[PDB]
Ligand binder design. Structure first.
Ligand SMILES: Cc1cc2nc3c(=O)[nH]c(=O)nc-3n(C[C@H](O)[C@H](O)[C@H](O)COP(=O)(O)O)c2cc1C
Ligand code: SF4
Ligand code: SF4
Lengths: 180, 430
């Protein structure tokens, strides 16, 4: 969470969310009159895993996303409505992309599953979609895993499967594997 | 009490009798002055009888509203739905011109407690809370001693005063805020949160302290009620005019020969009050720039209006002002009206809780503009802009503190526009 409290109109959406929904009860309006201010009176960090939702709840940009800071403008982004595989809730999300890059992820309304809230992991895990990526088929040799074409990898898999028979072939599916 | 002329209240007609603290303010003196006299009978007569007698007396509410006390008390629920009823006495007396409630708390503690018993029985409230200003430590000590004494003699508690009624009284104190005098903000403060007013479409009679039906009434109304039930509603009705019947405590302050707190029948002429009880304006009646009639919230009145103005609710309404509290403030010709109204604007900028946008921002805007006008920095169009801003604030706020911030500035513009124009032009000229 990035803070610009000068831009803060004194609605109480962040405080009401932190109390009623998130339930960490960390934010409040301290002060009286014009110098009334919103935030933790002490130096505290927002602990809920629903912390990202205050950014969307904030109407006037006083609370903003630090990972998605000064990177793009709204009109530049193409939004595609998809679902979050972070957990089995299947939270409905809208992925905003510029070119070939995902820039930000925000929730969608589905009263059935995710009212309009998104967990922090799902919201901010797009950063790890640009790192440690696999781009090409790799076949092992004495020099290690090395670049290979699709045909060569399939040939190696064929030579390997030829040896195995029956239950010697074993499949382990991952957390993010799809039905197809 | 004569319909033609009102004034010159006699000692026999005064409710508050040790207002000046010449006698023992505690229980020994209180019983000898007529307090706690026959409270058994008045309470035993039933809540309905008390409500009808208060309604017939015509007692309007002290504290600024002026709303009829009997009707407000009759709005309380008759039968419990599982929720207790509460009586809260607003002894928070924050108002820039008002000192009247402090004398009652410190010199007549037992009248207030007896009134709390009577009104709680009238509204069917099991428990009562006397909210007092945190700054009023000694006055609170006096009230607490009165409560303890009343408990000791059985005037309060189960089978209070010998009648089959049950009432428990507590004394609670704030930490200093003008807003905590408002009905909902006081309830929020006593609940334990910040003293920020609640939107009124839910009304305190429906849901109040701890979510239960409550009524907030001023110390003066609660204190005057028991003697109204003793002396009689007709006696109370006789003194004032129509719709404005009772006597009220007038606190004269400012440039007067003797600043005094006094009890007088309503509908006394303001000139008569100032000249007889206050000793006259410092330098004579000729030496009047303006008079603030009802404390700082209400608009000020110029001398010309002060000539014929009568000390009443509806009449001050006709004179584009109000008798919120009988806190009359007198200014000499020497006084700079601009600076005093700017100080009131600073007061309201300091006392806004900040909950709603219009008060929180426009009151500081008003203070800044008034500060510039106090030096002549502003332009001539700034006055019209100031009127427009005051109109913007009024009516669009949660509570009446926005209205109370707008009104003094509007009165200054309306009656003393010439001096503001003079100051603005002269600074440019010189
Ligand atoms: C900003 C603000 C401050 C107030 N301060 C006081 C106060 O200090 N004392 C008081 O008796 N009423 C105060 N009032 C008026 C309250 O409404 C009060 O609790 C109520 O009018 C009492 O009703 P009554 O006239 O029947 O006694 C204030 C109102 C507002 C809007
Ligand atoms: S939600 Fe945003 S605008 Fe509203 S109080 Fe919180 S930070 Fe300020
Ligand atoms: S008008 Fe002023 S004091 Fe009243 S609720 Fe609004 S901001 Fe608070």
């Amino acid at each position: 969470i990035k803070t610009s409290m000068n831009r803060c109109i004194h609605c109480t959406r962040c405080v009401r969310f932190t109390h009623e929904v998130a339930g960490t009860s960390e934010l409040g309006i301290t002060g009286r009159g014009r110098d009334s201010e919103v935030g933790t009176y002490i130096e505290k960090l927002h602990s809920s895993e629903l912390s990202g939702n205050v950014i969307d709840l904030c109407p006037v940009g006083a609370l903003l996303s630090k990972p998605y800071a000064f990177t793009a403008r709204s009109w530049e982004l193409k939004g595609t409505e998809t679902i979050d595989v972070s957990d089995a809730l299947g939270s409905n999300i809208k992925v905003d992309c510029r070119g070939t890059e995902v820039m930000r992820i925000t929730p969608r309304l589905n009263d059935a599953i995710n009212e309009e809230w998104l967990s922090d992991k799902g919201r901010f895990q797009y950063d790890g979609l640009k790192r440690q990526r696999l781009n090409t088929p790799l076949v092992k040799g004495a020099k290690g895993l090395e670049n290979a074409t699709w045909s060569a990898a399939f040939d190696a898999i064929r030579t390997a499967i030829a040896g195995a028979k029956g239950n010697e072939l074993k499949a382990i599916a991952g957390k993010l594997a799809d039905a197809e | 009490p004569e319909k033609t002329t009102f004034g010159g209240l006699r000692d026999q007609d005064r409710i508050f009798t040790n207002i000046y603290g010449r006698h023992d303010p505690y229980i020994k003196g209180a019983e000898a002055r007529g307090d706690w006299y026959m409270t058994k009978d008045l309470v035993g007569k039933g809540r309905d009888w008390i409500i009808d007698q208060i309604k017939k007396s015509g007692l309007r509410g002290r504290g600024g509203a002026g709303f009829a006390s009997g009707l407000k008390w009759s709005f309380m629920p008759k039968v419990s739905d599982g929720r207790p009823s509460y009586l809260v006495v607003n002894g928070d007396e924050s108002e820039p011109g008002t000192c009247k409630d402090r004398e009652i708390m410190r010199h007549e503690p037992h009248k207030l407690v007896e009134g709390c018993l009577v009104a709680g029985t009238a509204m069917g409230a099991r428990a009562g809370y006397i909210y007092i200003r945190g700054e009023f430590v000694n006055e609170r000590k006096a009230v607490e001693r009165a409560v303890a004494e009343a408990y000791a003699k059985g005037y309060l508690g189960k089978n209070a005063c010998g009648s089959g009624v049950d009432f428990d009284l507590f004394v609670h104190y704030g930490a200093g805020a003008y807003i905590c005098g408002e009905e909902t903000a006081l309830i929020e403060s006593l609940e334990g949160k910040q003293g920020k007013p609640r939107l009124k479409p839910p009304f305190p009679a429906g849901m109040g302290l701890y979510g239960c039906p409550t009524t907030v009434t001023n110390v003066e109304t609660v204190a005057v009620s028991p003697t109204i039930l003793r002396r009689g509603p007709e006696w109370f009705s006789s003194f004032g005019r129509k719709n404005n019947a009772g006597t009220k405590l007038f606190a004269i302050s400012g440039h007067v020969n003797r600043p005094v707190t006094v009890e007088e029948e309503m509908s006394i002429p303001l000139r008569e009050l100032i000249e007889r009880h206050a000793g006259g304006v410092r330098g004579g009646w000729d030496n009047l720039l303006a008079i603030i009639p009802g404390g700082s919230s209400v608009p000020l009145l110029p001398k010309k209006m002060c000539d014929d103005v009568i000390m009443d609710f509806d009449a001050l309404r006709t004179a584009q002002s109000g008798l919120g509290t009988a806190a009359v403030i007198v200014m000499n010709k020497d006084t700079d009206v601009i600076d005093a109204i700017a100080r009131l604007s600073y007061f309201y900028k300091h006392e806004s809780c900040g909950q709603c946008t219009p008060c929180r921002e426009g009151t500081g805007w008003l203070y800044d503009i008034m500060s510039r006008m106090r030096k002549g920095d502003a332009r001539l169009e700034e006055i019209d802009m100031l009127w427009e801003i005051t109109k913007q604030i009024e009516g669009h706020t949660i509570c009446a503190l926005g209205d109370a911030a707008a009104w003094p500035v509007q009165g200054l513009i309306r009656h003393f526009r010439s001096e503001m124009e003079d100051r603005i032009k002269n600074a440019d000229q010189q």
